[PDB]
């Protein structure tokens, strides 16, 4: 079945260029034409062009010729978009989209001359229901996975977008469960920042 | 080109409430050749990818509840949810797949209404590891409350302190369409041991007097 896999984000510092990646599966590479969207937080989707990769044929959007360039590998069924000469407007999630209908995990392009830096995970304990805490904080860029107990404590988790100043990013997550067993059964935030490369499992212990 | 113009920007729903929204193109998407009209419908829950939920304007995709209805032929398109469900808040935009470029619409934001929730109010002092550092950050949570307007009064030995303070909020939860907030003070070790008692108020609907939180380094 249909997967367009797309890296989960992108450091590119300003007037750099950067090669964006969609590896498609479950169907076959050249039998679709592949589509590219780029979306802000701002304002509404952009439809940056399209390539048929069984012939390399492109329809661009006028207003992406000169910026984005459309390019695939039938070898490796992948599809890739050239963004040239990235300024702050460049900043956006770009997505893939097998015609038009399955779009790709979409890739988070930051532009900024700000150095990766990996976060500080501190653990947030309490001074008939228990609420505990995992503070990442300092790190860029985005994102960073957090889990508590490898993923198997979903129910009663609340993580918050991360807050951004000076180039760093701040990011926190509570799990609440019943009083009664914490801390006989441990809790643990799994924290993972890919681009310094990063993995910290912080228990939550009493004061 | 073609211009997508879609309306309203946003709508907020009781759970079972008929949700219409519009989608006006500049130019009929109606093909003379097959007579279908090129117009989509697309889905995009808070952090997700888009997913497609009607095409040629009113044939849903395969696996999409049927209560996601659509309509218009033209110029003028309508997509319809019969009756609103919390799950289904979201983004919903349309886009025409009738000449290049491909023009999307801007998105209508669809959240839900429900009762009154009080939020659950939990204060965290600077951890060891962080003070070891320098550092001294104080979070505040405030989970699972409705309606979302709310406000976090920072006090430091019984002064309010305004100055320093970042919040964060969650998307509205797709079960039980509360939202959650948190709030951190943030500090220096030296700063933080030239106070006592840290307190933090959240003043909510669901209350006229505020929650109070505090505790004493």
């Known amino acids: 079945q249909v997967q367009l896999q797309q890296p989960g984000s992108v450091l590119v510092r300003p007037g750099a260029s950067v090669k964006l990646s969609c590896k498609a599966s479950?169907?076959?590479?050249?039998?679709?034409?592949m589509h590219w969207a780029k979306q802000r937080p701002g304002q509404g989707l952009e439809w940056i062009g399209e390539?048929?990769?069984?012939?390399?044929?492109?329809n661009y959007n006028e207003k992406f010729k000169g910026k984005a360039t459309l390019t695939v590998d039938t070898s490796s069924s992948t599809a890739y978009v050239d963004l040239s000469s990235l300024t702050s407007e460049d900043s956006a999630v770009y997505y893939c989209?097998?015609?038009?209908?399955?779009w790709g995990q979409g890739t988070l392009v930051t532009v900024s001359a700000a150095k990766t830096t990996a976060p500080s995970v501190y653990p947030l304990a309490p001074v008939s229901s228990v609420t505990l805490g995992c503070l990442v904080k300092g790190y860029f860029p985005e994102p960073v996975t957090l889990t508590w107990n490898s993923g198997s404590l979903s129910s009663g988790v609340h993580t918050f977008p991360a807050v951004l100043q000076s180039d760093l990013y701040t990011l926190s997550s509570s799990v609440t469960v019943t009083s009664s067993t914490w801390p006989s059964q441990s809790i643990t935030c799994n924290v993972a920042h890919p681009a310094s490369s990063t993995k910290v499992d912080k228990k939550i212990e009493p004061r | 080109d073609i211009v997508m113009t879609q309306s309203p920007s946003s709508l907020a729903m009781s759970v079972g409430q008929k949700v219409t929204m519009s989608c006006k193109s500049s130019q009929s998407l109606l093909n003379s050749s097959n007579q279908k009209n090129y117009l989509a419908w697309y889905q995009q829950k808070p952090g997700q990818s888009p997913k497609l939920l009607v095409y040629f304007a009113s044939t849903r995709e395969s696996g999409v509840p049927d209560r996601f209805i659509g309509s218009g032929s033209g110029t003028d398109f309508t997509l319809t949810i019969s009756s609103v469900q919390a799950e289904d808040l979201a983004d919903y935009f349309c886009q025409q797949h009738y000449s290049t470029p491909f023009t999307f619409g801007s998105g209508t934001k669809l959240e839900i209404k429900r009762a009154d929730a009080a939020p659950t109010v939990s204060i965290f002092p600077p951890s060891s590891e962080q003070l070891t550092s320098g550092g001294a950050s104080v979070v505040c949570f405030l989970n699972n409350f409705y309606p979302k307007d709310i406000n976090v009064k920072w006090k430091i030995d019984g002064s309010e302190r305004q100055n320093g303070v970042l919040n964060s909020w969650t998307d509205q939860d797709s079960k039980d369409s509360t939202y959650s907030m948190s709030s951190t003070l943030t500090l220096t070790k030296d700063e933080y041991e030239r106070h006592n008692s840290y307190t933090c108020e959240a003043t909510h609907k669901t209350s006229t007097s505020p929650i109070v939180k505090s505790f004493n380094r």
């Open positions: 989209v097998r015609g038009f209908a399955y």
């Open positions: 390539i048929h990769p069984n012939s390399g044929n492109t």
């Open positions: 479950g169907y076959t590479f050249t039998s679709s034409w």
